[PDB]
């Protein structure tokens, strides 16, 4: 059979593509210091397939730590427009969501929605480590359930 | 833990200091959760008498 | 006053009252001011609202049971220092700080006098006075109200 | 008009302007374009997708949080389209593709999916059924893409009358299929084509005007530049199938009476002017006829 | 008594009488040297004698407050020279602060003092890019915190909160593209500033 | 009654100081092992 | 009124002032679009920085005037080199954005501005 | 040294503030009411 | 009390008896060796690390978290919109407009928290009079959308109809300890 | 000996898990073998297995079951599962399970835990609850 | 192939904080200040709430002073572990790293038991402490203190007689003394070059008057007499907790009046008067008097200080945070003269570019 | 437990659904709205009168430092009862 397999396929091409990501984590804030908690031991990324520090432009997944100006996004977009094009987005922290703090101010971006695209918010202004980890999980099945062939067959 | 009496002189020797004793991370004998509720001290000026905002 | 209530006794209790659907009462809180009973008096011209028996035990309001609505009876609720009354429209609708408040005239009636104006998130809550010395004194009617 | 539709909001991107749409096939090229300077002034733009959601991530944003909703169908199914558009002040059609299928060609797409969409419009209470065929299509064409689009501008008609047409001329974009064609490798070949935001801008003006209730346009711009003075000229800038190559040797017309753009609040942008932005991605003035 | 963060009255009279020593050896362009009851000092001065007072207090043995920490500018839009630029020292050899503190309208300059102490290279340059006040004689004014395209300066009481745009990524364009401000939440004015004084002897007779 | 948590008194000492414990030999016995054991292979 | 002045006495001292700065980004157009990728050519360019200096022409004090001049030099500086992007070069000509209408008529079919 | 001038003094230009926010904004001085309930 | 961390030059008569020691603390490392063995001991410990959704790490039951709005134990929603708890919230996060309950009662028509805002402080849960709003241990409530998390109030009963269970025992360990 | 005291001890942490199904499961499950004292195996099947010796972020380690509310919980395992009277004995906030001392009913609390629904039906979505704050007019439907 | 001339751009994430603090009032604003040294939090709580109360004219009862101090040098244990190591990591050094961010993770631990959360504790605030700390926290404390000074010379086994990191950071930045108070360093970059000075001990505020203590002073200046400084100020901690744990007085916190500290949950539900300051608290605030401080606090990164303006409004009138990196970073280019790129990264490192302070 | 509108949706608390002609149920679409089924005015009714002795007690919600501060209420009326604000109970006099 063919479609039956190529759903097969898919549940294998988006396991590579899973189990093992490269990210390109800003710091940027205090945001930023749980993901070296993150990195650390004891709620460890690299157990996934994960990789501490990749370059960007081999990324596969942005991860935004921190508060977002108005003067870091061209910066920011930049990158966005480097890395290839399965990219993934992560938005840590409150301050890149919608700007938790600082949704008000004016050399301040009210959210890094407002900027790129996101496949995942996540929560909390200090966005405890394993916070986030449930959340990059949710990104690792946000992509198992998505089918890129499953569909092509039909187009 | 489970250090079977080899290593732990592999780790002194590679390492120094008797470090079993020292180690890294906790296992027992810390923080044995849910202590009893305690029933708090009370500040000054609970006193009933000489106490007015004036002299505070 | 002081950081500490050292009363630990027991308080007491009132009944509340039922003067009409402008006007809420909650005369537990009553602090036995007269600063209402002397406006009815001497700037209505009602003489309902007595004072009702004596040590803590007092309690203002009639001593039967009527509405106490006339023309100036909204006035009695800027008046009340206490929140023991307070009006029924904006019983809980919103909460003063968060107001920003304007500054504006009366209409509906020709004397043009004075208000504050309540608002919150681009809306209205309350109708309040301003102070002009000539214009009325102080206060509203209750229609404007 | 009920309360909310209403557009009270300087601007845009958290205003409101009641134009609660539909755009369907808003997610390769024009679309989201459309979406741009619908998403920016405040605008409840629906986007119904039916392909990965990684083809449709460039959508969340150019949208102010709840302005822009997403959701599931496929063509080959009736009252999904229905469901997709129960709330629809507006309907927006742009389907379309350069080549058949093994499941859908030319004539499914252009012609008997506008059809329902049409029908399913009509039976609830909508207003306007801004679709897009093409210029060129009268019928008879040489090719066999463009005489079934006419069609589909006759099979409207008969079901939703009063619906706004747009035919426009050829469209040139970053991304396109139509420059890149040529920078990826002639007389009596002339055309004038069209910016795209001179597209996008005038179908976003074209859902709130008190016209356009039933005319068809046809947004072609200026500049009719002739085909190998330009196709060098791309060549002097820069340093498949048989119904596409067979539309390209098609192209010609000549305005004879309509709409345009100037008469709907459209300042045309012509070709050499934003040529470049597009034509970068391939580094290291052309002759215009009246007729 | 335990809770009034004890007076230690004694170095108020140092700070004073060393309060005095600065007037009568200084009394061009000084006006009201002062104290708080926090005993912290205060010198106010007129723009116009600047560094000799400063070189006095990084170059004196019996002032060396050769180390700055601050160069602010405090806002107060009702009196004609609105900018009070404030300046803050301390001694590493008499273990002590002192406050210089000086005026400007919104166009009054006021010279520099990086021949004198260095650390005002950028604190000097905020004030620049938050007040809009221009230095005399200070090497490469720019920004700093502000983009490179905001107009304004934003620490004014003047400039609103949530300021005059707002950025965003117009896709047409490919740019992190600017239009103007549309909030969703409207922040909220409150009026938290109740009556009565709080703090008599202490206040304002009309 | 009141019990927040104050210690009991003591809780001993601590280690504060660096207490680098120099293993490694001499020095002689690095060399004339070394050249001691390199000229084994020179025989 | 006996103002301190700064960089200039009477305005048409500070007219000169101004157009060494003319000087410079009537020649730093060409130099920002090529080293840069932009859209503009050249002309628009400098039709939209005359166009700042026909904004500013309503001045008549010289303290106002030898401020105006620094700002241009910073952007200037800040143009000058690479410090900037083609998003903040480009910011200035308000591109997107609709210009609202000029007339009344039009200018309250939306919006409360008076 | 000093100069001499007598004029409005202008500042409309050192704040951004484009073109809506200047002229089209009235201003409202005033001593702010008694809150009467206080 | 001031502590020189490096002054030990001094001219000791730099002899072939210790002079060659840092020769040979040099070309025959052991330095080196002395940085590198250690690391050696820790391969053979025992890693720190843990199988997160299979075993998750410690908390406390004062952990700043997703909040919550509490009920009386006879039904009752314990929420009475007094208005201090956005007039403290920081993030200026929340509109809490209410009314009459036609009961004659007083609760709300709205609540909200925009959980982009909401910092977490801690200030509404000790701020309410009533523990009406708390915030509770939950962490993995990240989601996909912007949206999702613009909690509004029903999100936010249900909730707190959720972990009740929760609160009022981590709650039963800290009230008498604020 | 020594070494073979390990294996002693490690040999039945394999053939400790039932048969090789009910270990080899565990294996790809949650690739963490080791013995525990079971104490929970709440509805909808979690386990909370429990060994006080391991260190401080190990003594306890919890077993999803598969078959969810309709979700399959073979593969996709969360953390917002777990529902709320054994997170709070799970993070080491306290000691006692909810076995010995459970959570006290209110008869209004939910009789099943929802997960984290990510992008599903089933999950949020925003309200503006605040009934509508105006009233507009209704013309009336006679003529003149 | 050389350095001459650097210039940095510090303006990247800027965010109007001292602007946005004239809208909110102290309390209001509090955890603002954990942002600035968002590795080092309670430290500019520790400042902020001086700042209130020099003008409220308060010192905090003892017990509450008192663990300002503790947690006031745990603080000071994170920022070097976090500026030791990723000095570390962009020199290269990427194990030492890990080894404390368990140790550092025992250390969040003692703020989420103590304080809500792990980080951003808003757990000191002007009227003292928000809420006394639990039974199981202290007797944790000890058994961690004990195990942590190994932890330490365990690393500085590896590092501190490493040619790799010795040679690639003696000699370099080689700072000047009395150039440094032109400049204001004022923290460790300073005393890393022989200028004997601590506010702690010449400026002394808190309970630290009783701690006997010492300043581990930097001679010949550079990068590796800054790093062994701020080796042994970790270090020192551990002879202040010591000191800071085995005679902790049993007292109140959240200080007696309750104008000035929330009353007790339990008393503001009876007692009136502790019911309507717990409305005006956390709605209006303190109502401090008009003045000004300039205070200071010697951070890991050295002397954080507010200068706070008030007025007779509970809200402030331009607070002003000052940054002690912020001249650090403007004698970034003139340190690195007659130096190349790849001890720039060292530079970074050794001015603790913690940026948030760096920022606003 | 709720009611529901013609249309089909569910009604909160509060009388909050869309009318037909609103856009607002797009978001609702291949979605779902989520609601509370617990009316607290259902469920306080549900709730017995505590028929105390003397005409004024004080109220509570189980736990003095655990909830409702300690108001108190005149309950004169054998007419209606009285309430405590906080709560939504109600009480009687026994006489
Ligand atoms: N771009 C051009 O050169 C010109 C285009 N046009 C017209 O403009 C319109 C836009 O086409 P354009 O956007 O340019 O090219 P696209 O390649 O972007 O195709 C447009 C959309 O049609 C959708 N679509 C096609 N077939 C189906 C189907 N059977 N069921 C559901 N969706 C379908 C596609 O979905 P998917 O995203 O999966 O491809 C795509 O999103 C078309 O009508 C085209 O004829 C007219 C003149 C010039
Ligand atoms: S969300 Fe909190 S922790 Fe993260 S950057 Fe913002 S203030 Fe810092
Ligand atoms: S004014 Fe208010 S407090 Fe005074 S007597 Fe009247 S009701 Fe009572
Ligand atoms: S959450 Fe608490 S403080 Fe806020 S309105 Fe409800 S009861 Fe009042
Ligand atoms: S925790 Fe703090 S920031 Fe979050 S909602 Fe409560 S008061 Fe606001
Ligand atoms: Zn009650």
């Given amino acids: 059979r063919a479609e039956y397999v190529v759903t097969k396929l898919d549940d294998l091409i988006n396991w590579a593509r899973r189990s093992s990501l490269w990210p390109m984590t800003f710091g ?128 | ?20 004793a020292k180690l890294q991370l906790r296992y027992q004998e810390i923080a044995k959760r849910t202590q009893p509720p305690p029933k708090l001290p009370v500040g000054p000026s609970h006193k009933l008498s000489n106490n007015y905002y004036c002299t505070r | 006053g002081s950081d500490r209530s050292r009363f630990l006794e027991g308080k007491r209790a009132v009944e509340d009252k039922n003067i009409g659907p402008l006007v809420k009462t909650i005369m537990t809180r009553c602090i036995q001011c007269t600063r209402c009973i002397r406006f009815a008096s001497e700037i209505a011209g009602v003489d309902d609202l007595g004072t009702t028996g004596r040590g803590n035990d007092m309690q203002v309001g009639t001593y039967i049971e009527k509405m106490f609505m006339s023309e100036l009876s909204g006035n009695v609720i800027d008046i009340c220092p206490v929140g023991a009354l307070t009006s029924k429209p904006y019983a809980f609708t919103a909460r003063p700080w968060e107001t920003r408040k304007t500054e504006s005239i009366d209409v509906m009636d020709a004397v043009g006098s004075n208000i504050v104006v309540s608002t919150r998130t681009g809306e209205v809550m309350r109708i309040l006075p301003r102070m002009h010395e000539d214009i009325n004194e102080e206060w509203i009617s209750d229609k404007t109200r | 008009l009920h309360h909310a539709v209403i557009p009270h909001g300087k601007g845009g991107r958290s205003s409101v302007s009641g134009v609660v749409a539909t755009v369907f096939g808003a997610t390769g090229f024009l679309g989201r374009y459309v979406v741009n300077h619908l998403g920016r002034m405040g605008s409840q733009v629906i986007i119904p997708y039916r392909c990965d959601v990684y083809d449709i991530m460039h959508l969340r944003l150019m949208g102010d949080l709840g302005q822009l909703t997403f959701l599931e169908w496929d063509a080959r199914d009736k009252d999904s389209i229905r469901k997709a558009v129960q709330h629809s002040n507006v309907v927006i059609n742009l389907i379309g593709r350069e080549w058949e299928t093994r499941n859908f060609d030319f004539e499914d ?42 069609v589909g501008e006759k099979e409207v008609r008969s079901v939703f009358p009063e619906a706004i047409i747009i035919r426009p001329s050829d469209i040139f974009g970053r991304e396109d299929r139509f420059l890149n064609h040529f920078a990826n490798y002639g007389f009596k070949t002339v055309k ?100 | 008594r335990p809770t009034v963060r004890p007076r230690s009255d004694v170095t108020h009279k140092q700070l004073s009488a060393f ?136 620490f004014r009481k003047d400039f609103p909160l949530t300021g005059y745009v707002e950025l965003r990524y117009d896709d047409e364009v490919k740019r992190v593209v600017a239009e103007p401000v549309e909030l969703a939440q409207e922040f909220r004015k409150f009026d938290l500033n109740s009556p009565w004084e709080a703090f008599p002897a202490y206040r304002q007779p009309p | 009654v009141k019990q927040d948590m104050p210690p009991p008194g003591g809780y001993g000492p601590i280690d504060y100081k660096r207490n680098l414990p120099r293993r490694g030999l001499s020095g002689y016995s690095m060399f004339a092992v070394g050249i001691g054991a390199l000229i084994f292979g020179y025989w | 009124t006996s103002v301190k002045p700064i960089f200039s006495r009477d305005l048409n001292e500070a007219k000169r002032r101004v157009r060494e700065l003319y000087r410079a980004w009537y020649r730093e157009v060409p130099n920002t679009v090529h080293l840069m990728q932009l859209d503009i050519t050249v002309k628009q360019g400098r039709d939209k920085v005359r166009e700042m200096f026909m ?36 910011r200035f000509f308000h591109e997107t954005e609709t210009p609202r209408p000029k007339d009344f008529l039009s200018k309250f079919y939306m919006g409360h501005d008076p | 040294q000093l100069i001499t001038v007598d004029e409005k003094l202008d500042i409309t230009t050192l704040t951004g503030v484009p073109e809506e926010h200047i002229k089209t904004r009235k201003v409202r001085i005033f001593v702010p009411a008694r809150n009467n309930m206080q | 009390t001031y502590k020189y961390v490096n002054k030990k030059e001094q001219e000791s008569e730099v002899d072939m008896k210790s002079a060659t020691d840092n020769a040979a603390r040099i070309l025959m490392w052991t330095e080196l060796i002395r940085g590198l063995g250690m690391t050696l001991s820790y391969l053979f410990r025992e890693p720190a690390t843990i199988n997160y959704p299979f075993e998750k790490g410690p908390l406390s039951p004062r952990f700043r978290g997703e909040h919550a709005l509490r009920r009386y134990p006879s039904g009752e929603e314990r929420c009475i919109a007094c208005k201090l708890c956005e007039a403290i919230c920081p993030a200026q996060a929340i509109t809490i407009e209410a009314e009459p309950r036609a009961d004659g009662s007083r609760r709300t028509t709205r609540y909200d928290i925009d959980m982009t805002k909401c910092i977490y402080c801690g200030f509404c849960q000790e701020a309410c009079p009533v523990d009406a709003i708390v915030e509770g241990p939950n962490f993995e409530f990240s989601t996909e959308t912007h949206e999702e998390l613009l909690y509004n109030k029903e999100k936010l009963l249900n909730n707190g109809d959720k972990w009740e269970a929760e609160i009022a025992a981590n709650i039963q360990a800290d009230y008498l300890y604020r | 000996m020594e070494l073979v005291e390990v294996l002693k001890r490690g040999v039945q942490q394999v053939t400790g898990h039932g048969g090789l199904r009910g270990l080899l499961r565990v294996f790809f499950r949650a690739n963490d073998i080791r013995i525990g004292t079971l104490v929970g195996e709440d509805k909808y099947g979690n386990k909370y297995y429990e060994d006080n010796k391991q260190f401080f972020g190990r003594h306890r380690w919890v077993i999803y079951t598969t078959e969810m509310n309709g979700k399959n919980t073979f593969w996709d395992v969360d953390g917002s599962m777990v529902p709320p009277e054994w997170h709070r004995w799970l993070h080491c906030m306290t000691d006692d399970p909810p076995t010995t001392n459970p959570p006290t009913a209110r008869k209004f609390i939910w009789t099943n835990h929802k997960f984290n629904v990510s992008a599903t039906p089933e999950q949020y979505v925003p309200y503006s609850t605040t009934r509508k704050k105006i009233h507009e007019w209704v013309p009336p439907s006679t003529p003149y | 192939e050389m350095v001459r001339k650097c210039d940095p751009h510090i303006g990247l994430l800027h965010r109007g904080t001292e602007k946005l603090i004239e809208y909110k009032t102290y309390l209001q604003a509090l955890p603002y200040f954990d942002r600035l040294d968002y590795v080092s939090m309670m430290c500019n709580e520790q400042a902020y709430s001086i700042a209130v109360e020099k003008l409220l004219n308060i010192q905090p009862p003892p017990r509450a002073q008192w663990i300002r101090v503790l947690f006031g040098e745990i603080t000071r244990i994170l920022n070097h572990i976090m ?117 702690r001990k010449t400026q002394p505020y808190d309970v630290y008057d009783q701690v006997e203590f010492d300043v581990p002073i930097g001679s010949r200046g550079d990068c590796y007499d800054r790093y062994l400084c701020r080796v042994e100020e970790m270090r020192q901690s551990l002879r202040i907790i010591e000191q800071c744990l085995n005679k902790m007085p049993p007292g109140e916190i959240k200080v007696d009046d309750a104008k000035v500290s929330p009353p007790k949950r339990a008393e503001m539900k009876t007692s009136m008067e502790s019911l309507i300051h717990h409305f005006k608290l956390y709605t209006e605030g303190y109502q401090v008097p008009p003045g000004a401080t300039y205070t200071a606090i010697e951070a890991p990164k050295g002397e954080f200080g507010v200068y706070l303006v008030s007025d007779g409004s509970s809200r402030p009138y331009r607070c002003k945070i000052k940054a002690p990196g912020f001249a650090h970073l403007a004698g970034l280019d003139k340190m690195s003269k007659g130096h190349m790129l790849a001890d720039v990264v060292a530079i970074i490192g050794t001015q603790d570019i913690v940026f948030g302070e760096i920022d606003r | 437990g709720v009611q529901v509108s013609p249309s089909g949706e569910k009604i909160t608390h509060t009388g909050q659904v869309y009318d037909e002609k609103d856009y607002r149920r797009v978001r609702f679409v291949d979605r779902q709205k989520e609601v509370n089924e617990n009316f607290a005015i259902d469920l306080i009714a549900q709730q017995p009168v505590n028929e105390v002795e003397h005409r004024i007690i004080a109220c509570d919600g189980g736990g003095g430092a655990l909830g409702h501060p300690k108001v108190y209420i005149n309950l004169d009326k054998e007419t209606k009862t009285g309430t405590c604000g906080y709560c939504g109970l109600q009480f009687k006099q026994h006489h």
């Avoid at chain 4, 795209?196 to 072609?220: E, L, M, Q, R, Y």
């Avoid at chain 4, 791309?234 to 192209?251: A, L, N, Q």
């Avoid at chain 5, 230095?135 to 490179?148: Q, S």
């Avoid at chain 11, 757990?123 to 058994?143: K, N, T």
């Fill in chain 1, 28 to 155: 940027l804030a205090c945001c930023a210091v749980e993901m070296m908690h993150m990195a650390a031991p004891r709620y460890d990324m690299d157990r996934f397939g994960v990789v501490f520090r990749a370059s960007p432009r081999q990324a596969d997944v942005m991860i935004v730590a921190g508060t977002l100006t108005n003067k870091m996004a061209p910066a920011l977009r930049k990158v966005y427009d480097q890395m290839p094009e399965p990219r993934y987005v992560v938005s840590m922290g409150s301050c890149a969501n919608g700007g938790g703090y600082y949704h008000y101010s004016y050399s301040v971006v009210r959210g890094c929605d407002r900027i790129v695209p996101v496949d995942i918010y996540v929560p909390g202004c200090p966005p405890t480590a394993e916070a986030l980890l449930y959340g990059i999980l949710q990104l690792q099945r946000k992509i198992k359930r998505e089918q890129k062939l499953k569909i092509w067959y039909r187009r």
């Fill in chain 2, 1 to 20: 833990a489970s250090a079977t009496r080899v290593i732990q002189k592999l780790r002194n020797w590679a390492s120094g200091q008797d470090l079993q």
């Fill in chain 4, 109 to 150: 797409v252009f012609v008997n999916i506008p059809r329902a969409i049409a029908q399913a419009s009509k039976e609830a209470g909508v207003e306007r059924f801004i679709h897009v065929s093409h210029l060129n299509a009268s019928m008879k064409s040489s090719s066999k893409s463009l005489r079934s689009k006419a």
């Fill in chain 4, 192 to 291: 004038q084509p069209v910016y795209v935001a001179d597209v996008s801008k005038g179908i976003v003006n074209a859902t709130k005007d008190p016209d356009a209730v039933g005319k068809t346009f046809a947004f072609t711009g200026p500049n009719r530049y002739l085909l190998f003075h330009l196709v060098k000229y791309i060549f002097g800038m820069t340093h498949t199938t048989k119904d596409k190559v067979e539309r390209i040797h098609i192209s010609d017309v000549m305005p004879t009476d309509l709409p345009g753009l100037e008469d709907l609040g459209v300042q045309p942008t012509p070709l050499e002017l934003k040529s470049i932005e597009v034509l970068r991605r391939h580094r290291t003035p052309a002759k215009t006829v009246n007729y």
């Fill in chain 5, 19 to 154: 309060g005095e020593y600065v007037a009568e050896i200084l009394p061009k362009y000084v006006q009201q040297v002062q104290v708080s009851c926090l005993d912290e000092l205060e010198i106010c001065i007129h723009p116009d004698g600047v560094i000799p007072t400063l070189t006095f207090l990084r170059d004196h043995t019996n002032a060396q407050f050769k180390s700055l920490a601050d160069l602010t500018a405090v806002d107060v839009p009702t009196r004609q020279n609105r900018f009070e630029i404030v300046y803050n020292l301390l001694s590493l050899r008499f273990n002590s602060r002192i406050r210089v503190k000086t005026y400007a309208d919104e166009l009054t300059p006021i010279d520099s003092i990086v021949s004198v102490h260095i650390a005002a290279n950028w604190y000097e340059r905020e004030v620049w890019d938050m007040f809009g006040v221009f230095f005399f004689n200070h090497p490469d004014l720019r920004r700093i915190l502000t983009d490179y395209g905001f107009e304004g300066h934003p």
């Fill in chain 7, 55 to 90: 904004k500013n022409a309503h001045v008549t004090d010289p303290r106002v005037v030898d401020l105006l001049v620094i700002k241009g030099k910073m952007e200037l500086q800040e143009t000058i080199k690479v410090w900037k992007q083609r998003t903040h070069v480009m």
């Fill in chain 11, 83 to 199: 500026a030791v190591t990723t000095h570390a990591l962009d020199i290269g050094a990427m194990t030492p790293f890990f080894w404390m961010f368990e140790e550092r993770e025992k250390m969040f631990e003692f703020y989420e038991r103590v304080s809500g959360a792990r980080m951003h504790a808003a757990y000191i605030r002007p009227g003292g402490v928000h809420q006394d700390l639990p039974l199981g926290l202290l007797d944790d404390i000890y058994e961690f203190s004990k195990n942590f000074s190994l932890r330490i010379d365990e690393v500085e086994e590896m590092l501190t007689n490493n040619r790799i990191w010795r040679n690639r950071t003696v000699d370099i930045g080689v700072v000047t003394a009395e150039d440094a108070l032109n400049y204001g360093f004022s923290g460790v970059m300073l005393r890393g070059s022989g200028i004997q000075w601590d506010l």
